[PDB]
Amino acid sequence: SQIRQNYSTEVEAAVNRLVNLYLRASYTYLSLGFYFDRDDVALEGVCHFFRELAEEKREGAERLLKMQNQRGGRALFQDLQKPSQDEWGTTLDAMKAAIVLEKSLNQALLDLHALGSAQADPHLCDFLESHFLDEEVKLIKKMGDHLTNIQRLVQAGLGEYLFERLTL
Amino acid sequence: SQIRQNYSTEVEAAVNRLVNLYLRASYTYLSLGFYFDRDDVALEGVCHFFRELAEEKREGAERLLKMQNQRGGRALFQDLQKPSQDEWGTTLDAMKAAIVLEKSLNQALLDLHALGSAQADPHLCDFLESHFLDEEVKLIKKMGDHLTNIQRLVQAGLGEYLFERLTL
Amino acid sequence: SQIRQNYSTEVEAAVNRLVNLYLRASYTYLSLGFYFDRDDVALEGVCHFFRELAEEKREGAERLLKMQNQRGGRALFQDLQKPSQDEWGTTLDAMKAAIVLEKSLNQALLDLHALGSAQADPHLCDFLESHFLDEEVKLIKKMGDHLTNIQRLVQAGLGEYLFERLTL
Amino acid sequence: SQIRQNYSTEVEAAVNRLVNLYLRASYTYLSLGFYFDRDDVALEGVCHFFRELAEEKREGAERLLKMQNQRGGRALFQDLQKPSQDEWGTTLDAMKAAIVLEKSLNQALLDLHALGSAQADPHLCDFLESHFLDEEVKLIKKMGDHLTNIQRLVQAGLGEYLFERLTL
Ligand SMILES: CCC[C@H](C)C1(CC)C(=O)NC(=S)NC1=O
Numbered sequence: 001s002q003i004r005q006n007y008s009t010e011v012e013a014a015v016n017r018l019v020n021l022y023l024r025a026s027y028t029y030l031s032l033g034f035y036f037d038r039d040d041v042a043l044e045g046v047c048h049f050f051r052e053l054a055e056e057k058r059e060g061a062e063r064l065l066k067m068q069n070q071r072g073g074r075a076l077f078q079d080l081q082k083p084s085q086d087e088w089g090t091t092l093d094a095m096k097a098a099i100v101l102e103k104s105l106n107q108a109l110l111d112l113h114a115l116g117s118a119q120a121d122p123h124l125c126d127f128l129e130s131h132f133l134d135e136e137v138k139l140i141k142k143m144g145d146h147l148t149n150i151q152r153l154v155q156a157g158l159g160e161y162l163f164e165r166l167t168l
Numbered sequence: 169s170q171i172r173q174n175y176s177t178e179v180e181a182a183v184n185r186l187v188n189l190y191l192r193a194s195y196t197y198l199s200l201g202f203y204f205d206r207d208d209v210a211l212e213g214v215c216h217f218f219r220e221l222a223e224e225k226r227e228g229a230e231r232l233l234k235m236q237n238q239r240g241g242r243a244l245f246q247d248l249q250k251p252s253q254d255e256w257g258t259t260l261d262a263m264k265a266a267i268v269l270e271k272s273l274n275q276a277l278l279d280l281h282a283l284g285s286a287q288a289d290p291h292l293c294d295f296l297e298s299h300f301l302d303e304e305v306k307l308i309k310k311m312g313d314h315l316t317n318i319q320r321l322v323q324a325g326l327g328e329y330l331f332e333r334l335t336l
Numbered sequence: 337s338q339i340r341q342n343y344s345t346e347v348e349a350a351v352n353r354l355v356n357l358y359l360r361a362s363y364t365y366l367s368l369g370f371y372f373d374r375d376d377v378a379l380e381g382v383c384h385f386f387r388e389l390a391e392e393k394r395e396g397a398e399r400l401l402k403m404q405n406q407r408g409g410r411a412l413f414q415d416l417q418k419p420s421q422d423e424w425g426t427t428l429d430a431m432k433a434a435i436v437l438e439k440s441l442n443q444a445l446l447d448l449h450a451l452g453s454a455q456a457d458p459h460l461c462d463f464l465e466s467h468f469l470d471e472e473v474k475l476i477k478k479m480g481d482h483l484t485n486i487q488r489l490v491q492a493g494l495g496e497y498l499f500e501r502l503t504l
Numbered sequence: 505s506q507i508r509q510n511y512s513t514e515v516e517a518a519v520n521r522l523v524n525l526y527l528r529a530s531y532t533y534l535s536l537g538f539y540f541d542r543d544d545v546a547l548e549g550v551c552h553f554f555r556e557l558a559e560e561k562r563e564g565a566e567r568l569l570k571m572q573n574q575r576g577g578r579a580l581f582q583d584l585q586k587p588s589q590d591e592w593g594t595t596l597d598a599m600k601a602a603i604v605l606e607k608s609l610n611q612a613l614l615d616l617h618a619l620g621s622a623q624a625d626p627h628l629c630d631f632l633e634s635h636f637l638d639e640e641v642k643l644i645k646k647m648g649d650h651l652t653n654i655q656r657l658v659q660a661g662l663g664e665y666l667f668e669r670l671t672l
């Protein structure tokens with residue numbers, strides 16, 4: 001590539017993997033969103049919460065793809081694995097699964113940052129810090145807060161309704 | 169009729185029956201609405217929900233009557249049977265009865281559509297699809313969502329109050 | 337399902353398959369979009385054209401999922417297969433592949449409509465006609481128009497630049 | 505210096521060198537700009553492109569000088585070497601020379617960042633990342649895109665005119 005400079009093949013490949021992880025995360029949130037839209041689940045606040053997260057992860061993937069091109073790397077796409085569950089249980093179950101997912105994304109980000117540091121790639125490191133690392137930390141804090149409130153509310157049916165109405 | 173074209177006597181009669189069904193549905197919702205306005209029931213959100221549905225069914229009947237005339241059919245009215253209950257019990261009972269009513273209207277619509285198809289009456293078929301079929305599907309989904317939330321809330325008295333305050 | 341009415345297991349499954357097809361189409365357009373964003377391809381008008389299509393297909397999938405829930409069907413997700421190519425060649429190659437993709441989506445829509453008709457499911461048939469069938473016909477006409485203009489322009493390099501600047 | 509803290513003599517000197525590089529880059533773009541303003545070259549879009557870059561590099565130098573003072577370093581200026589060419593040939597030649605220049609600036613930035621990291625000077629590292637590293641990456645991507653389009657257009661005279669009219 002005519003523009004490629006200080007961009008290692010290792011980082012390029014790791015960025016492609018992280019794109020796949022973000023798209024897969026988006027797909028998972030899509031599934032979570034429509035599960036709470038089921039007539040036998042019917043928690044619209046929860047549905048909206050997860051659908052918004054699907055959009056955020058998709059946007060994250062697109063930002064990574066833009067950066068890949070800006071650096072002269074080449075986007076390579078793989079199959080997107082279907083979400084790990086077909087039915088997501090209670091709001092509590094769903095939020096626990098969401099925090100597990102975000103922590104795995106966060107760890108992938110931290111791994112990529114470490115790689116960037118080892119390759120002496122400051123543009124990559126700054127890119128991750130500015131657009132991804134703090135966003136993940138804030139989202140995980142929010143999920144933790146939600147989990148704590150859901151747990152304190154669980155009269156389980158009553159608690160789930162009130163959380164959806166008054167928080168989400 | 170000078171304007172009548174491709175409008176079978178079978179469809180004409182079925183449309184008159186569907187008008188009666190919609191007016192009867194409107195009357196039922198009128199009764200449901202005023203039951204929840206009783207001082208010993210006193211659930212204003214529920215009262216408003218059903219009164220709005222009474223207006224919707226009445227409007228549906230008028231749209232059918234307009235179409236009957238547009239096609240050159242002749243409106244024939246029958247007695248409107250009084251609603252099946254004088255007292256409607258809990259919000260849960262009422263919502264269950266409402267979904268039963270809507271499914272019966274929906275089935276009458278599907279039957280009429282089938283008749284239209286067999287008579288090769290595309291104007292009728294399009295009319296039902298554009299103004300009735302999707303409206304019914306959306307209303308039934310909403311009722312299902314309500315039923316699910318009411319059920320998860322039923323501290324029965326507390327649940328009924330919260331649903332009325334926070335959803336309706 | 338408490339709300340499910342006149343919704344066959346066959347249609348439910350076919351809708352799930354069509355969701356997968358739309359998500360896969362969205363993924364393909366995502367890949368096409370970022371290919372034209374490469375510094376060694378650099379056709380921004382083409383990139384934007386395909387990225388907008390990615391968004392349209394994704395929205396189509398979400399509308400299908402909403403309808404699945406409205407009817408009381410159950411969304412089931414499968415792996416999304418990666419796009420059929422990693423590199424998409426010229427604008428001409430890409431547009432040809434795009435029209436092939438849209439025709440396959442269109443055929444899946446026509447198959448589903450035929451299924452709906454055979455199952456006597458007028459809500460499904462109306463849903464497809466109102467939101468999908470005409471959109472596909474219009475998009476395919478537009479692509480055909482583009483293909484014809486690209487072809488008349490192909491001084492191949494010059495033609496590709498002018499099309500991107502003056503049409504897209 | 506009363507304010508100087510954690511600012512090594514090595515970084516101070518490297519910053520002075522980078523100021524010289526940016527001023528020299530500004531001077532080069534000034535020359536490129538006025539070459540395309542010649543009546544026997546006459547490509548106003550190209551002239552404007554390079555004149556804007558002259559202003560950007562000059563601003564970059566001033567930001568470095570401001571930072572030097574903020575840290576308690578002492579600005580030292582050297583002769584500015586005249587640009588490497590008096591005449592810049594075709595738009596293609598000029599854009600190639602521009603990308604070579606930007607890559608050399610980028611490498612100087614990466615070297616300075618590496619120095620900062622080795623000296624444990626996080627303020628310097630953050631300063632470069634926030635104001636210089638991403639700007640360079642974006643500018644180099646843009647130049648690569650331009651080069652690719654110029655190349656696809658080169659009927660050389662015709663191609664050069666169209667690029668100037670329709671892109672710049
Ligand atoms: C908002 C969900 C997006 C969706 C899950 C998905 C991946 C399947 C995505 O992340 N991005 C695009 S472009 N299309 C898609 O279908």
Ligand SMILES: CCC[C@H](C)C1(CC)C(=O)NC(=S)NC1=O
Binds near residue numbers: 526558559561
């Ligand atoms: C816009 C060009 C600026 C110009 C080349 C130059 C260096 C010669 C510069 O970069 N900055 C200042 S203050 N004066 C100058 O003459």
